[PDB]
Design a protein around this ligand. Structure first.
Ligand SMILES: Nc1nc2c(ncn2[C@@H]2O[C@H](COP(=O)(O)OP(=O)(O)O)[C@@H](O)[C@H]2O)c(=O)[nH]1
Ligand code: ALF
Ligand SMILES: [Cl-]
Ligand SMILES: [K+]
Ligand SMILES: [Mg+2]
Length: 251
């Protein structure tokens, strides 16, 4: 059964989209942190697709156990599609998560939600330019006005039938070296995600993966060599490459 996962920042409208897609009446509230558990439901206009409502999340190195529920679901390899719910009134902040979702190798479709709010402010966003620079389908949606919801579900269903944010070309060299140290120690689909997180020295990924001391000592040397090349800390290199890529989008 094809599983689509609603992933986005808190209070972006994920459960609101879920209810309209499923006909369910799950808890919707105008404050972050309503949804704390995963909830499933069939797409009413396509009973072959099962969609998953998930708690809000800012980062795949999450800051809360509720956000880690969404992260753990994605890394369980059950999801066939990521329906990235993006708050259009915070494009740049939401897109930080987006870059990490694309890196998971699970195909990403963006629901650019709350577009009615940005219409009231008179601001426009070209979905074609954003889709081109991000490498994923993008559909403007309104859960309040009930617009674009059916379109983003059908395109999310078709991304399961990938181009990654290309970063500093010195960072991509380290990433590919870490990938060859990993070999089959990670799922092929999300190998880039794990390579980057190991470069970030992410505690969760380090504990989750079962790497030999031979693998770790080389990864430590790739990071150290690359840190000296960049004259910058490893964690810092990845964060600024993400934000530099996001700014390149909105230009
Ligand atoms: N104006 C507007 N408000 C929305 C939209 N989608 C959700 N909301 C509101 O945003 C708040 C949070 O919605 P929820 O669906 O609970 O967000 P989640 O935290 O992503 O599950 C609620 O007050 C919803 O009515 C939308 O497209 N437009
Ligand atoms: F903040 Al929520 F569902 F309530 F992401
Ligand atoms: Cl988070
Ligand atoms: K909410
Ligand atoms: Mg919710």
């Amino acid at each position: 059964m094809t599983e689509i996962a609603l992933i986005g920042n808190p209070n972006s409208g994920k459960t609101s989209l879920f209810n309209l897609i499923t006909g369910h009446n799950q808890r919707v509230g105008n404050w972050p942190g309503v949804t704390v558990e995963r909830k499933s439901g069939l797409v009413k206009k396509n009973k072959d697709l099962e969609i998953q409502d998930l708690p809000g999340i800012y980062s795949m190195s999450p800051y809360s156990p509720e956000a880690k529920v969404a992260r753990d679901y994605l890394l369980s390899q059950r999801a066939d599609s990521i329906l990235n719910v993006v708050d259009a009134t915070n494009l740049e902040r939401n897109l930080y998560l987006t870059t990490q979702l694309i890196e998971t190798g699970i195909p990403v479709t963006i629901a650019l939600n709350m577009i009615d709010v940005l219409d009231g402010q008179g601001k426009k966003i070209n979905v074609d330019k954003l889709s081109y620079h991000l490498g994923v389908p993008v559909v403007a949606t309104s859960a309040l006005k009930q617009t674009g919801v059916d379109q983003v579900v059908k395109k999310a269903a078709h991304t399961t039938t990938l181009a990654f944010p290309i970063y500093d070309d010195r960072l991509e060299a380290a990433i590919s070296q870490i990938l060859e140290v990993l070999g089959n120690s990670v799922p092929q689909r999300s190998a880039r995600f794990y390579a980057i997180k190991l470069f970030e020295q992410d505690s969760l990924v380090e504990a989750e993966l079962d790497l030999s001391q031979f693998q770790r000592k080389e990864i430590e040397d790739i990071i150290r060599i690359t840190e000296e090349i960049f004259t910058e800390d490893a964690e810092s290199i990845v964060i600024n490459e993400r934000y530099a890529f996001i700014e390149r989008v909105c230009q």
